[PDB]
Amino acid sequence: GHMGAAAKKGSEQESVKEFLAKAKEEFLKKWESPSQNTAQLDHFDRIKTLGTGSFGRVMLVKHKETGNHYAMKILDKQKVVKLKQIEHTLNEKRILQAVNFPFLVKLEFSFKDNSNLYMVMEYVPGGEMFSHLRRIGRFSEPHARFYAAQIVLTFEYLHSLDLIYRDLKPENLLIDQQGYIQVTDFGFAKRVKGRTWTLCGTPEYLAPEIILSKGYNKAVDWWALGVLIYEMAAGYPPFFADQPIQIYEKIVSGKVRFPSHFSSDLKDLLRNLLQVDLTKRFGNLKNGVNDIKNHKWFATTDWIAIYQRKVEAPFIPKFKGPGDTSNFDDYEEEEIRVSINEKCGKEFTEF
Amino acid sequence: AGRTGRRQAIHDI
Ligand SMILES: c1cc2c(cc1C[NH2+]C1CCCC1)OCO2
């Protein structure tokens, strides 16, 4: 057969099972008993906006007592208006306070006031994968593979907890001081036993079953991994158009074209991730994530060494010291204003 | 030809 090696991989798969069982036990303790109101706004100096998004912004902040830096996500409760915008916000905070994995950003505090919701996380000063990718054009296949391996492991962890991530893309991936990934922006993540039905995500990364209004499952994350790997290795995503509706027609079609510099191993992996037929999509078959981990394109990947952060990264971001924001783009600043009247108190009771 | 800037995710398409 292909391996002569097979005993090492099998023992390795029993160890994965052992790890995930302990991880589930730890997750459930925190999921059932969530932390709440662990800080307040005047505990932090606000320094600079690091990015914006639905409902507010993420700012670099500095804790006054300790001097530690953090990334504070600020959500304007009055912009979180639609039913699934509200539900998604509660998902994000509850999941983040319960997970623990080397490639997931750590939530350190959360709290709310009359006007806003706040989530305070570790600050990752190396910037977004997005910026680095657009600046250098594309990553070589070994470089893309190193990042992809971390997403594979992160999704194996999340899916084992019945969590779907649903917004994979370079904007959501930060590069830490060792050159490894941190996944942030859990605004679309959800705990799902079975199917879910919300039409949500980013157009370029949507699986066909989402676009087609089907009840869908964690396999949408494996589709999105295919989109991410393609975009990392090409410099642009596989379903690329100016308007969302044009993107959706390309996604559903069952067709994908590859750059001439893609290796055949890479194209084979991508054809099996970017597979419209759910009975054929890698990550969704009887062998689960192992069809991905055992694919030829990953043959050089030491999965355990990646998890243990023993592999030398392809790129280390420049860092000038604590609180350095040089790896982030600039955004317009807007003063935080807290109303004297509690807004939307009943919609965010649980936050 | 397609979008090169940061992409916003949509909560309810
Ligand atoms: C996503 C969701 C948001 C947000 C910002 C984002 C964009 N990514 C962040 C910016 C810095 C890196 C991580 O402000 C409010 O909710």
Residue A87 CA: distances (Å) to CA of A72, A177, A184, A188, A199: 20, 33, 18, 10, 13
CB-based burial of residue A293 (10 Å sphere; 0-12 exposed, 13-18 middle, 19+ buried)? buried
3-state secondary structure of B10: strand
Question: Which residue, judged by its Cα, is nearest atom 9 of ligand 1?
Answer: A51
Same domain, yes or no: A118 and A43: yes
> Residue A160's domain spans which residues?
16-33+128-318
Q: Tokens 């750059």, residue?
A: A259
Residue A66 tokens, joined: 């300790």
Q: Which residues of A33-61 are buried (b: 16+ CB within 10 A; e: fewer)?
A: eeeeeebebebbebeebbbebbbbbbbbb
Question: Do residues A151 and A167 make contact, with C-beta atoms less than 8 angstroms apart?
Answer: no
- Do A77 and A146 lie in a common domain? no
Does residue A3 lie within any of the structural domains? Answer: no
Residue A122: φ, ψ to 5°: -55, 140
DSSP-assigned letter for residue B5: S
- The pair of structure tokens assigned to A148 is 């992809």
| A6 within some domain | no
Q: Is residue A184 lining ligand 1, measured as CB closer than 6 Å? A: yes
Task: Assess if residue A10 is contained within a domain.
Answer: no
A145-179 as b/e, with b when 16 or more CB fall inside 10 Å?
Answer: bbbbbbbbbbbbbbbbbebbbbbbbbbbbbbbeeb
Q: With CA atoms as reference, report the closest residue to A227 among A154, A169, A167.
A: A169
Expressed in Å, this structure's resolution amounts to: 1.6
| Phi/psi at A269 (5° precision) | -60, -45
State the Cα angle at A166 between A165 and A167, rounded to 5°. 100
* Closest Cα in chain B, distance from residue A53 (Å): 7
Q: In whole angstroms, what is the distance from residue A161 CA to residue A26 CA?
A: 10
Q: Please indicate, yes or no, whether residues A89 and A185 belong to a single structural domain of this protein.
A: no
Q: Are residues A146 and A66 in the same domain?
A: no
**Do A161 and A301 lie in a common domain?**
yes
Say which CATH number the domain at A102 has: 3.30.200.20
CB atoms within 10 A of CB A332: 7
Gap from B8 CA to chain A (nearest CA, Å)? 6
Residues from chain B contacting residue A240 (CB–CB below 8 Å): 1-3
Q: How far apart are CA A196 and CA A163, in angstroms?
A: 11
Instruction: Give exposure, A68-91, as e/b (b: 16+ Cβ within 10 Å).
Output: ebbbbbbbbbeebeeeebbebbbb
HSE toward the beta carbon, residue A282, CA cutoff 13 A:
18
**Rounded Cα gap, residues A300 and A168, in angstroms:** 24
Are A119 and A200 in a shared domain? no
Q: Is residue A141 part of a domain?
A: yes
* Number of independent structural domains in chain A: 2
* A235: number of Cβ within 10 Å: 15
Tell how far the Cα of A305 is from the centroid of ligand 1, in angstroms.
Answer: 30
Closest CA relative to residue B11, chosen from A172, A51, A202 = A202
- Say if A335 falls within a structural domain: yes
The enclosing domain of A172 has a CATH number of 1.10.510.10
Shared domain check, A67 and A184? no
Residue A221 near residue A159 (C-beta atoms within 8 A) = yes
CA distance A46 to A334: 11
From A42, A45, A167, A291, active-site residue = A167
A116 inside domain: yes
Same domain as A25, residue A46: no
CB A42 within 8 A of CB A90: no
Give the Cβ contact number of residue A270 at 10 Å. Answer: 23
Looking at the structure, tell me whether residues A184 and A208 fall in a common domain.
yes
Burial class of residue A230, CB neighbours in 10 A (0-12, 13-18, 19+): buried
Of the residues A240, A248, A331, the best mutation for testing chain B's interface (the one with the most B CB atoms within 10 Å of its CB) is A240
Residues A264 and A287 both lie in one domain: yes
Annotated binding site of A for ATP: 50-58, 73, 122-128, 169-172
Q: What is the C-alpha to C-alpha distance for residues A108 and A66, in angstroms, rounded to an integer?
A: 13
Same domain for A309 and A187, yes or no, is: yes
3-class DSSP string for chain A: CCCCCHHHHHHHHHHHHHHHHHHHHHHHHHHHCCCCCCCCHHHEEEEEEEEEECCEEEEEEEECCCCCEEEEEEEECCCCCCHHHHHHHHHHHHHHHHCCCCCECCEEEEEECCCEEEEEEECCCCCEHHHHHHHHCCCCHHHHHHHHHHHHHHHHHHHHCCEECCCCCHHHEEECCCCCEEECCCCCCEECCCCECCCCECHHHCCHHHHCCCCECCHHHHHHHHHHHHHHHHCCCCCCCCCHHHHHHHHHCCCCCCCCCCCHHHHHHHHHHCCCCCCCCCCCCCCCCHHHHCCHHHCCCCHHHHHCCCCCCCCCCCCCCCCCCCCCCCCCCCCCCCCCCCCCCCCCCCC
Residue A9 lies in a domain: no
Quick check: is A101 in a domain? yes
Distance CA A18, CA A7 (A): 17
Is A324 annotated in the active site?
Answer: no
The amino acid sitting at A138 is R
A341 and A199 in a single domain? The answer is no
In the structure encoding, which two tokens stand for residue A18, read together? 């052992």
